A paper describes a structure:
ATP synthase is a molecular motor that converts energy from a membrane electrochemical potential into the high energy phosphate bonds in the ATP molecule, which is utilized throughout the cell to sustain its life by hydrolyzing ATP to ADP. Chloroplast ATP synthase (CF1FO) from higher plants has a unique redox switch that serves to modulate the ATP synthesis activity. The CF1FO enzyme actively synthesizes ATP in the reduced state, whereas the oxidized form has a low activity. Our cryo-EM reconstructions showed a complete view of the enzyme complexes, composed of α3β3δγεabb′c14 subunits, in different redox and rotary states.
One sample without DTT or IBZ treatment was taken as the control sample. As prepared for the functional measurements, three different protein samples in detergent micelles were imaged: reduced (DTT), oxidized (IBZ), and control enzyme complexes. Although the density maps generated from the control dataset could be categorized into three different rotary states, they were generated at relatively low resolutions (5.2–7.9 Å). One explanation could be that the control dataset was composed of multiple states, conferring a greater conformational variability in the population and thus flattening out the high-resolution details. Previous cryo-EM studies and our structures of the ATP synthase showed different proportions of the three rotary states: rotary state 1 is the most populated, and rotary state 3 is the least populated. This uneven proportion of the particle distribution implies that different energy levels are populated in individual rotary states while the motor rotates. As such, in the oxidized and control samples, the rotary state 1 is more energetically stable than the rotary state 3.
Author numbering:
A (entry chain e): 1 to 131
B (entry chain J): 85 to 111
C (entry chain M), D (entry chain N), E (entry chain Z), F (entry chain O), G (entry chain Y), H (entry chain P), ...: 3 to 81
Q (entry chain I): 30 to 62
R (entry chain a): 22 to 244
Amino acid sequence: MTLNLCVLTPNRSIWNSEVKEIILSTNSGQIGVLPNHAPTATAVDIGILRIRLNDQWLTLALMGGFARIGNNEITILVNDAERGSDIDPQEAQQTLEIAEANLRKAEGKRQKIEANLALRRARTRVEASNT
Amino acid sequence: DFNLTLPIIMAEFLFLMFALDKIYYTP
Amino acid sequence: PLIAAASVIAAGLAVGLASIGPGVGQGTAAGQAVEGIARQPEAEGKIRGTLLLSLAFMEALTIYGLVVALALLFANPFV
Amino acid sequence: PLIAAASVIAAGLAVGLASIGPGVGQGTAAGQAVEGIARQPEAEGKIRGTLLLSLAFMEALTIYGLVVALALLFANPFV
Amino acid sequence: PLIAAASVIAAGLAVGLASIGPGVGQGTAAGQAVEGIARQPEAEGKIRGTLLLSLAFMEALTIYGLVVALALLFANPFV
Amino acid sequence: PLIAAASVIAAGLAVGLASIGPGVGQGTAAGQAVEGIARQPEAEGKIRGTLLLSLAFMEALTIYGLVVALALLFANPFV
Amino acid sequence: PLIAAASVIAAGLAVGLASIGPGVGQGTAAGQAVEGIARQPEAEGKIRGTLLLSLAFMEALTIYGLVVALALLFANPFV
Amino acid sequence: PLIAAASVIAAGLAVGLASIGPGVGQGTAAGQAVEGIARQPEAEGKIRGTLLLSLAFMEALTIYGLVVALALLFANPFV
Amino acid sequence: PLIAAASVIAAGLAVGLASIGPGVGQGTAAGQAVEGIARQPEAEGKIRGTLLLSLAFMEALTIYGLVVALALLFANPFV
Amino acid sequence: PLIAAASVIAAGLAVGLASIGPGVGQGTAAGQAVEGIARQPEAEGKIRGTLLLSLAFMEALTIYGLVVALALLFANPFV
Amino acid sequence: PLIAAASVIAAGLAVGLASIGPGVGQGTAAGQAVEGIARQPEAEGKIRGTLLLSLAFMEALTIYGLVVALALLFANPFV
Amino acid sequence: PLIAAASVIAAGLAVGLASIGPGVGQGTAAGQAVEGIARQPEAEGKIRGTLLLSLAFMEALTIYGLVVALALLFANPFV
Amino acid sequence: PLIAAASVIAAGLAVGLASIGPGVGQGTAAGQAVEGIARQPEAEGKIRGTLLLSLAFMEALTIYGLVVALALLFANPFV
Amino acid sequence: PLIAAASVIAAGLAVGLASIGPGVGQGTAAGQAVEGIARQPEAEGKIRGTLLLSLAFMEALTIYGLVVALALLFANPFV
Amino acid sequence: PLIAAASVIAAGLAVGLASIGPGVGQGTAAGQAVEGIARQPEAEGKIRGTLLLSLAFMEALTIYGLVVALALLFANPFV
Amino acid sequence: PLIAAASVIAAGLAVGLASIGPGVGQGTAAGQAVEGIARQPEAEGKIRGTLLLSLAFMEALTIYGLVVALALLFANPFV
Amino acid sequence: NLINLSVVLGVLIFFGKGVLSDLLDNRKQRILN
Amino acid sequence: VGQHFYWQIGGFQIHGQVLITSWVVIAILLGSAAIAVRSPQTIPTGGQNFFEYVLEFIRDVSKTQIGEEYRPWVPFIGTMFLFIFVSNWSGALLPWKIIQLPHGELAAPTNDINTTVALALLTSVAYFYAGLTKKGLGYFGKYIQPTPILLPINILEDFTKPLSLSFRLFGNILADELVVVVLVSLVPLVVPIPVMFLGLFTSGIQALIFATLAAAYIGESLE
């Protein structure tokens, strides 16, 4: 009932099993991917991939990347992913807090990009504390 | 045309409100 | 006399100006709906149901115009 | 006389010019709504509810125009 | 007399202004539908069915206008 | 006489030309709002509240036009 | 007399205003359909069938207008 | 006489032509504002405040038109 | 008399308003078709065949208008 | 007489045609301004100041039209 | 008399309204065709042949209008 | 007499048709200027100066129209 | 008499309505052609030849209109 | 008499129809110019000079229209 | 008499309706040509030559209209 | 008499309808030219020269219209 | 009104039973699980 | 056709049409409500499933719209929604043609303007009552917070929104009534079947939309 997905990481080739719904979030916004979807190129961003096993809404925090998505061939070139809640949930809330700790500085325009990536990385990291 | 049918309908509707509350909505 | 003639002209203008814009609307709806249904082959039934409801709203506006025209034509209260 | 004829012409122009733009609006709404509902198959119920509320607002404007036309036609205070 | 002439002018204006916008709508529908059906060669049957239903709605609005014109022309209740 | 007839024509033109543009506006609002609410399934309640406030502003303009038409129709200060 | 002259003017305005918009619609349909058929060289037969059905709907609206014009011209019920 | 009738026609044309464009404007504003508020769920309060100020400007223009119409209707300095 | 003059004016308005929109349509069709045929140099024959069929439909609508004009001009049933 | 009636018609046409386009302009301004302010949450104060200045320019044009209408209505130099 | 004058006015309106839209169409065709021929420098001959055929169809519609105008002008069957 | 009435109608048409297009222009200017100023938060002062100069040019055209209207109204050289 | 005056009005309307649309068409053609010729600096000669042929077709339609106007003006068969 | 009244109506129509389109043009110019000047903060002086020259051309066309209106108003060669 | 007056009105309508569309065309041509010449700084001479040829075609259509107007004005064959 | 009045109305309509479209054209030209000159800061002199030549062509069309208006106003060959 | 009301009532009763079956199946799945 | 009144003269003028329609509709609604809920189980029995699903959808639309304190106006909103739903269903599903009313005609409750105006005044005064209960008694939401010129504009818009809802309801009811009347008056009653189906769908949609609009005005009162 599903598509060949390739959750591809720099050093990793995270699971090649296959599931129903793909609600990857781009810079524009989310889009729901299901079987026989039209072949699309999407710049998936720091939001969260929620995965529908067809039994379970399991939910993967991905750090970023790209998704070349086609006819049951779909390929997501992730920057970094953690399958489900691979991080610890209380530690997920704690990572939100400790990247809150280092977002408190401000360096011009210059390292505000680092501040943004820290805060949004924690903001997708807090997902596995949520569910 | 705005006759007394307005107050008649409002009075009949408040009874239906309280009657739904008493009969089905609370039970 | 002139009253029934002007009522007929009223019904004709009403029917034409009502059918003009709603056709264009329903067509734009159908085009983007078909593009979306081609983009995703999954929810075609619910998409067709929602499109049927919206086309029913547009055709209901068109039928209100056509009913005003038929009331002017067949049994007009003025003439 | 001429008064009821002009009231009929008024009702016809009102109905046509009211139904013209709202059909195009509701169609653009339906097209982009169906494109969005195809993009995301999750919130179709709430999307259909919001679209029904907005189409109800547009059809309420159209029904206000049709009611002004019917008041001019059936029981006009002038003629 | 002048009443049948004005009813004929009404039917002509109704038919023209009804056929104008719906043709443009159905054409935009057909263009985006053909672009989508070329993008995905799978659901052409259901896409053609939905497009036929929507074109039937547009042609039903056009046929309502043409029927009002034919009622004004052949057997008019005024003249 | 002619004064009440012209007031009726005024009310009809007012109602039609008021309902024309606001329907198209509310439809464009609804289409882009539904596209956005499909893009993000989170803030649908606040989005629906803001859309209801804006549609209330548009329907308030339309109701001001309809109220001017009803004041011209039912109890006109001129006729 | 003046009645047949006004019926002829009605038929002319009907034919022109009917043929105007449908030509533009069918052209937009043909342009996007040819762009799609060039994008995908596979489903040209089904695409041509759907385009023929839609162009048949548009030409059916145009033929309804032309038939109303021919009924006004050749054997008019008024004159 | 004719003066109050023409003042009524003036008020009707003023109200309709004032309400036409501002509805479309406020709708385009609402659509892009809702798309933006869906894109960013953070500054919804300040966005709603700025949108309320701009919709207040548009409704102030519409209310200036409606006030000119009410001044022509109720207590006209000419008639 | 005036009847043949009005029939001539009818034929002129019919021919002009028929040729206006179809030219724009066929031009948009040709532009996007040539852009597509430049994008893909493979299916130029089938693309030219489909474009010829669609341009034949548009020119058939234009020829129906021109034939109504020639029937009004040369051998009119009214005058 | 007819002079004050034509001055009233002038003021009505002036007010309507002045309020039409500026509402659409201010709405397009507000929509793109809100989209930008959502894109960047930093310079909302200066953006609101510039938008207030531009909306003040548009409302100043609208107020010039409304002031010409009020000068025609209340104390006209002609009548 | 008045018949030849009205036939001349018919021919003028026919020629102008026929030449209006087809020029815009052929221009849009030429613009997108030149953009495509610049995008691909390979099939310029077949592209020019197809563009010549389509411009011949548009100029054939324009020549049908001009021929109806010349038939009204030089040797009119009415006058 | 009729001369001052026609001069008043001239001033009203001048003021309305002058204020119509310039409002839309200044609004498009303001919208794209605010989008740009949100895109770059650096040169807001020079951008506001250039926008003020251009809005001054548009309001100068509008003030030329309003001054022609005031010259027709208050102290007309004809009447 | 009135016949030559109406023929002159016919020629003027023909020339204006013929020159209107073809100028816009040739301009759109020139704009996209210059954009393409800037995109590719290779086939400027063949592009200029094809653009000259298409502009010759548009100017031939315009010259047909101007020739009908000159035939109405200088040596009219009616007057 | 009627000659000075028609000259005043001419000046009013000239001023309004001249100020309409040029305002929209200068606004589109200003919007895209401000977007570009925000995209590149380097050549703002030369960009402002070129924009001032083009706005001077547009305001020169508007001033030619206003000067024709003032010549019709103040010292008309006819009346 | 009335013949020279109608010929003058013909020349005025011809000149205005001819200059309207060609200005917009040449402007769109110039805008896209300048965008292309900025995109590629190489073939500015040949691009300027082709743009000059196309602007010469548009100004030749405009000069044909202006020459018809001057022939109607200075030495008219009718009056 | 009426001849000079109609010539004045002709000159006014000519000037307004000539200045309308060319302002919009020159504005679109200026906007895209400024966007391009911001995109590339190199060829500003040649770009300004080409833009000055094209704006000179547009202002030459506008000056031809203004010269026809001044010839109708100051020293008319009819009156 | 009678014939159209009867046709609409038949189709509505059939489809309303078909939809209330799904709603009651959802509620039954909830309580059962 | 004839939509004025019947002179059941007491005190002043009265319209018997909406009186009879409102009595019949409220009686049918309360009688359907009390009969299957006289002994309801925790499992969704015969009428219990329909009544519980109605209460569930109403509670969903109310808890989504108003915010937190959606419980206190839940019977009021459900009364408005079910009253409009039953009136729009029964005015079309009930035959009034074989039986003849002498003085005027009588089909549906909201056909008179007074019914819609009374429901609108009920909703508007309930919104103002919630604004007085929640916000300060000195100045409610008519206070001009953003700029000092919006006080009478906000007051006029607040006065207009009730009449807007009443006009929407009256427009829908009269649209369905005129559609059925003219379609039956055209020719024999076999032609108008698809338009009647569309009218029934529009009746259900208008019921849900009236529920949502009442909840929207209630959330405005919550603001």
